C-alpha cells in the first residue's frame, strides 16, 4: 500500500562486477530479488542484497572454505542449511537468511566455536575488534551449555611479528590459506585432525615471508596478533586516520 | 486513533507513528495551529505540554526536530507532536 522499502544497496557499497549484463542470475534474498552475476556464491548474492551474512573463514580475496558453518542460510528447497560461502547462486534460488532454521544454525555453530575456545577475551589483543565476539554478541546465543574441560593448545613461535595463541584460534583455516595463496610462502599448516587441530608450522619456522603480517587482519580471532602491537592499545582507544604509506613506492 | 480522523489531514503533514508513543510529525507552519487542536477540543484534551525536546539530526536537511510532548490528563493519553526546523 504505497510502502517505503529501504534502498537495499550492497553490504559495503561493494561494486558488483558483471562479466556481462546478460548472465545476471536473479536470486531471492529474503523475498527481495537481486541480480547477481553468474557464479556468485549465495553469500555474495546476499552481500549484493545488503544482507550481511556472518562469516568466519570466508575471505573475498582468499579461497572459499567450509572450515566452519557460521553462515548456514536456508535456501528454499534444500534439506539442510547450505553454507552460503560455497553454494553458487542458481537462478531462482530463494535465500532466507533470517528464517528460524538459519538463526538456529548460526546459534548452534557460534556455540561450538565458543565451546573449546578459552576465555581469553580480556587478555586477547583483538578483544574489541573480534569477529567471534561481535558474531556471538549479535547472532550467537546469549548463554553457553558447555561446562567441561575446553581443549588448549600451546603457543607456536611464528616470529617477531605474529604473536600466536592457538588456543583462541578456531581452526577456520583462513591464515593457512592466506600463507599458501596470497603470501605464497606455504609455511602455515592445519596439523592434526579433530579438536586436536593446530594451525602453524610443524617445525619451529618463523614466517620468513614478508606480507605475512596481514594474517592478523585475515585472522577472525585474537590467536594471530601483532607481536609489536603486543598489547599496547585496544580496538576502541585507537583514533584512526585513513593515511597512506611511504615506505615502498607501491603507495 | 480518534485524533487522526478529526484532525485536518493537512495539519499532520509529513509523518505519523503508531507505537512507542504516537506522534504527528507535522510542519512548522501548522504546528501551533495543530497544538491549538488536541487542546481546547472536547474529545482530545491535552492541556499539558510535558516537554519540548529539541533533537538534532545533522544528516537531514531540516537539521533539528522540535519534539513537543503532550499529555492529556483527561483522556489519559500522550501525543508527541513534532516539527522540523533548521538553524535559521
Amino acid at each position: 500500500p504505497t510502502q517505503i522499502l529501504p534502498p537495499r544497496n550492497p553490504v559495503g557499497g561493494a561494486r558488483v562486477h558483471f562479466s556481462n549484463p546478460e548472465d545476471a542470475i536473479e536470486v531471492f534474498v529474503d523475498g527481495y530479488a537481486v541480480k547477481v552475476p553468474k557464479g556468485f556464491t549465495v553469500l555474495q548474492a546476499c552481500e549484493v542484497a545488503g544482507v550481511d551474512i556472518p562469516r568466519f573463514c570466508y575471505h573475498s580475496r582468499l579461497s572459499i572454505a567450509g572450515n566452519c558453518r557460521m553462515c548456514l542460510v536456508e535456501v528454499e528447497k534444500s534439506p539442510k542449511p547450505v553454507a552460503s560461502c560455497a553454494m553458487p547462486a542458481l537462478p531462482g534460488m530463494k535465500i532466507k537468511t533470517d528464517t528460524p532454521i538459519a538463526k538456529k544454525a548460526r546459534e548452534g555453530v557460534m556455540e561450538f566455536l565458543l565451546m573449546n575456545h578459552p576465555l581469553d577475551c580480556p587478555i586477547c589483543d583483538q578483544g574489541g575488534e573480534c569477529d567471534l565476539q561481535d558474531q556471538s554478541m549479535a547472532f550467537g546465543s546469549d548463554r553457553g551449555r558447555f561446562t567441561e574441560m575446553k581443549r588448549s593448545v600451546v603457543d607456536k613461535n611464528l616470529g617477531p611479528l605474529v604473536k600466536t595463541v592457538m588456543t583462541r584460534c578456531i581452526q577456520c583455516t583462513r591464515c593457512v590459506r592466506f600463507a599458501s595463496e596470497v603470501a605464497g610462502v606455504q609455511d602455515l599448516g592445519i596439523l592434526g585432525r579433530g579438536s586436536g587441530e593446530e594451525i602453524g608450522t610443524y617445525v619451529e619456522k618463523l614466517m620468513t615471508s614478508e606480507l605475512s603480517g596481514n594474517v592478523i587482519d585475515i585472522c577472525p580471532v585474537g590467536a594471530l596478533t601483532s607481536k609489536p602491537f603486543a598489547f599496547k592499545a585496544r580496538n576502541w582507544e585507537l583514533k584512526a586516520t585513513e593515511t597512506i604509506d611511504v615506505s615502498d613506492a607501491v603507495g | 486513533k480518534y485524533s487522526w480522523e478529526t484532525l485536518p489531514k493537512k495539519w499532520v503533514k509529513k509523518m505519523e507513528r503508531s507505537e512507542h508513543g504516537n506522534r504527528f510529525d507535522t510542519n512548522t507552519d501548522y504546528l501551533f495551529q495543530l497544538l491549538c487542536f488536541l487542546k481546547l477540543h472536547t474529545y482530545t484534551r491535552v492541556q499539558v505540554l510535558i516537554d519540548i525536546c529539541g533533537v538534532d539530526y545533522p544528516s537531514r536537511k531540516r537539521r533539528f526536530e522540535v519534539v513537543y510532548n503532550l499529555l492529556s490528563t483527561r483522556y489519559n493519553s500522550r501525543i508527541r507532536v513534532q516539527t522540523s526546523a533548521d538553524e535559521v
Binding site: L119, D120, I123, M149, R151, S152 | -
Partner: protein, 71 residues
C-alpha cells in the same frame, strides 16, 4: 625489570614480575589445567585452560602461575 620500572618507582618492594617468577610451577596430572584463579572460581580470573604438551612450564597469561605436566 624495565617494564616494571615505568609504573613502580619504589624499587624496594619486590616487583610483581619477580613475585610471580619465584613461585614454583605447579605439578598436575593431565594435559590441561584450570587455574581458575586463587582458589575460589568466582574470585579468580576467567578460567584459562593451559596446554602442557611442551616440556617447559606453560604460564597462565592472566595469573602468571606456571604449570608442568608431571608425568
Amino acid at each position: 625489570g624495565n617494564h616494571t620500572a615505568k609504573w613502580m618507582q619504589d624499587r624496594s618492594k619486590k616487583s610483581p614480575m619477580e613475585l610471580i617468577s619465584e613461585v614454583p610451577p605447579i605439578k598436575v596430572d593431565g594435559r590441561i589445567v584450570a587455574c581458575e584463579g586463587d582458589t575460589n572460581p568466582a574470585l579468580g580470573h576467567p578460567i584459562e585452560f593451559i596446554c602442557l604438551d611442551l616440556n617447559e612450564p606453560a604460564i597462565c597469561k592472566y595469573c602468571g602461575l606456571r604449570y608442568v605436566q608431571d608425568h
